[PDB]
Ligand binder design. Sequence first.
Ligand SMILES: [Mg+2]
Ligand SMILES: [Zn+2]
Ligand SMILES: [Zn+2]
Ligand SMILES: [Zn+2]
Lengths: 134, 65, 56, 46, 56, 263, 33, 84
Amino acid sequence: NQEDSMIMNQSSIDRGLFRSLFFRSYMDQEKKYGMSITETFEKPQRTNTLRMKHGTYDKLDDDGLIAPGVRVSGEDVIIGKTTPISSKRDASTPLRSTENGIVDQVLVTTNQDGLKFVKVRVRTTKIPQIGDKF
Amino acid sequence: MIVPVRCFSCGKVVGDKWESYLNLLQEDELDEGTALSRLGLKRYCCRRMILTHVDLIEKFLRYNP
Amino acid sequence: RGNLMGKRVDFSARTVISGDPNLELDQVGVPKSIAKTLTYPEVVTPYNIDRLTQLV
Amino acid sequence: ATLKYICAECSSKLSLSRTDAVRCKDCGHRILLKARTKRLVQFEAR
Amino acid sequence: PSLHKMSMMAHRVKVIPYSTFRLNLSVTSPYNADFDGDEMNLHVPQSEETRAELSQ
Amino acid sequence: EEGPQVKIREASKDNVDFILSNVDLAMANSLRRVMIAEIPTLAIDSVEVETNTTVLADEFIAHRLGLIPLQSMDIEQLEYSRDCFCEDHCDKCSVVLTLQAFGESESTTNVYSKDLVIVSNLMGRNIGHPIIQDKEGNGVLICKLRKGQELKLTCVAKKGIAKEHAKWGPAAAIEFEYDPWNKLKHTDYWYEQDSAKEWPQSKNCEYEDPPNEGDPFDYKAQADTFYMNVESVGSIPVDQVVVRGIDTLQKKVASILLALTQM
Amino acid sequence: KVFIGRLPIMLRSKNCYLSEATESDLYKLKECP
Amino acid sequence: KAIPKDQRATTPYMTKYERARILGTRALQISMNAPVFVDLEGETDPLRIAMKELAEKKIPLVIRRYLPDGSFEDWSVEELIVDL
RNA sequence: AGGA
Ligand SMILES: [Mg+2]
Ligand SMILES: [Zn+2]
Ligand SMILES: [Zn+2]
Ligand SMILES: [Zn+2]
């Protein structure tokens, strides 16, 4: 506990001392292009583009969304999306590389424009550790 | 936000004692210092657990789904 | 000034620092994760050959 | 069985697929949620 | 900031658990570090030659 | 009667006040640690969540579940899962608990440690029963639900020790004192005018003879006679918190004696 | 008579719904009192 | 231009930098499977092998010391004193 | 927009 550091009761930490919740909301939308060339929220596979993320797409459902129960981890794909070009290109949203957690709430709404609007909250419990500030 | 089971410092169960505490104050009218003591909360670590709790759960319950 | 006198560099790491009364003056506590990321290029020599094969 | 999306306010289940219209049935609001996986999630009690 | 040649010194690795760089307290002063949330940089040499510069 | 002696001052379901004499401080302290840290208990360790429509998060609940005290009387006949031979768990190494709750009432629906149910076969041993000390008989208040707030989950309670997690802590605070008159000169009292007036006397001052000023310092003197108080959480009865502590430390030293023997 | 654009309203102001709103309404409206 | 051995006037002692660079160099060479001029009495680290080589002044290297004018004095690691 |  020398030079502005401190000793914490691990026993208390277990008991719930200073534990917190952490939520982060990843968001995306289906961008429309002039000639009705809209995007697609789907779970894509190889099928020409090959230009897609490495994270397990296998956590996604047919709507290109993870169900709100699943424990997500690496750059696991949280939102599946495709962009058409004059063909499946990938516009998927992976979990922030470093971060890990559980899918909390998935919001499937509409943009003012009348477009597919998606918001994915991902929750984790952050327990007091050795470099944590107080 | 919802009564802590077990006092962080010593680990004596504190989970059962919430409603009982809240009651020793409304119905029995007693002061906080005597209520805790009735409930057998001797050490201040245990006392602070209940005495400083903020049962936010109730406010959360006020929303629908 | 930004790309030549200074440079962003590989084989570099950074985290929160905390003191240890059980470390020697000249040592530095490195987190397992940080050691598992940073790498040293060791030339396969008859001295190290067997050690290195096991690390591999 | 199956309740693909749930309503945000009236909380009525919706079970819709692509090109159905992003709205509730008897309720207005275009909000809608996702209803948790049928696959159980296990957590340690520590 | 690195206003000293002592703001950059060579240390022995000690691989340890927990996510912090651990330092002996007596080495605190030259760096001007404290543990109120300070962060430090670590650079790994790649040559037998480079290490010799650090150690020697 | 033999070696180190006990003299119980006060006993209850939850507390044991006693005096330990003809012992080294090292031994009283070692036992103090053992009671806190190494006595095995049974606690909820894995929680599969089927549905949770609550204001609380899955893991927030999961955590509270571990802290719920469970009957660990016959914990000695339950195997540590790690030592058990099954793919994961079984009746030989675990207690399966079920918790299903729903807001039928317009008023708030409460979820208690009483609402737990044993689904595993117990083999007629006293284990896994949620400890209820509560006056109205409800135990720990786990959750609160309004209406369509459903809670469905399954628990796997496993044998463990406080070293792994303080949830397997069989004891709450353990009181410990020796030499209430500072006869041993083991402390140097901080004062402003008088250490006698400024520092309150303890209960145990009565149980020991005051030093009587006109006497030289007993350097010869060593520390024996320890006024302790073991508080049980309910998992194990207070007597056993002490007995098992003595036993665990014995078995611990035994391991060393045996380890030398294998060598 | 004539529509001349849209003015962003400040929450809890006269022109905001929430001003005349009661604790109970806000909880229904999903707003923290 | 190259100052003759009988006209050298720089320290007869080895500089901190010279030693560091010699050890670094031999260590590198040893590590690159160069021939080792001393019995490795169980030794495996190329720096510790280099220190052993410098200890017995069995290192076949020469420090070319440049003067501000551009001239220089060549000194063998065998001849330089190691009081460091 | 914050941290030493
Ligand atoms: Mg600082
Ligand atoms: Zn306490
Ligand atoms: Zn609706
Ligand atoms: Zn088993």
